[PDB]
Amino acid sequence: SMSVKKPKRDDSKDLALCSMILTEMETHEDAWPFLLPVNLKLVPGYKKVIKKPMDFSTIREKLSSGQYPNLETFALDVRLVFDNCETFNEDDSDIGRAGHNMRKYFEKKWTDTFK
């Protein structure tokens, strides 16, 4: 509350550390469904169904241009990429499996870097 603060967690490396996590997600062999925005002209249903499209290239641009106010807003966009994937793709598909794999990979890097 006013004039009453928890001890100050060092957040000065968070930008760099989120950038490294993102590089590792970009270079995973199962990243291919997530590297670029879904083409809304060429994928029937996507525009209407997925209210908030997100992909790695869009996170990378937001990161590089100071559009994440803190590391939690960054995690929310990464998770949004996989939540969208689950909404639109069957579990038993290459893309559906890719998303489960990448979400796992992300959550481990996230815990090991920050928790």
Curated annotation (Swiss-Prot):
Q: What is this protein called?
A: Bromodomain adjacent to zinc finger domain protein 2B
Q: Which domain of life is it from?
A: Eukaryota
Q: Where is this gene product found?
A: Nucleus
Transmembrane region positions? none
Q: In which tissues is it expressed?
A: Expressed at varying levels in several tissues, whereas a smaller transcript was expressed specifically in testis.
Q: Which family does it belong to?
A: Belongs to the WAL family.
Summarizing the function annotation, the protein's role is: Regulatory subunit of the ATP-dependent BRF-1 and BRF-5 ISWI chromatin remodeling complexes, which form ordered nucleosome arrays on chromatin and facilitate access to DNA during DNA-templated processes such as DNA replication, transcription, and repair. Both complexes regulate the spacing of nucleosomes along the chromatin and have the ability to slide mononucleosomes to the center of a DNA template. The BRF-1 ISWI chromatin remodeling complex has a lower ATP hydrolysis rate than the BRF-5 ISWI chromatin remodeling complex.
Where does the record place the Bromo domain? 9-113
Q: Which gene encodes it?
A: BAZ2B
- Quaternary structure per UniProt? Component of the BRF-1 ISWI chromatin remodeling complex, at least composed of SMARCA1 and BAZ2B, which regulates the spacing of histone octamers on the DNA template to facilitate access to DNA. Within the BRF-1 ISWI chromatin remodeling complex interacts with SMARCA1; the interaction is direct. Component of the BRF-5 ISWI chromatin remodeling complex, at least composed of SMARCA5/SNF2H and BAZ2B, which regulates the spacing of histone octamers on the DNA template to facilitate access to DNA.
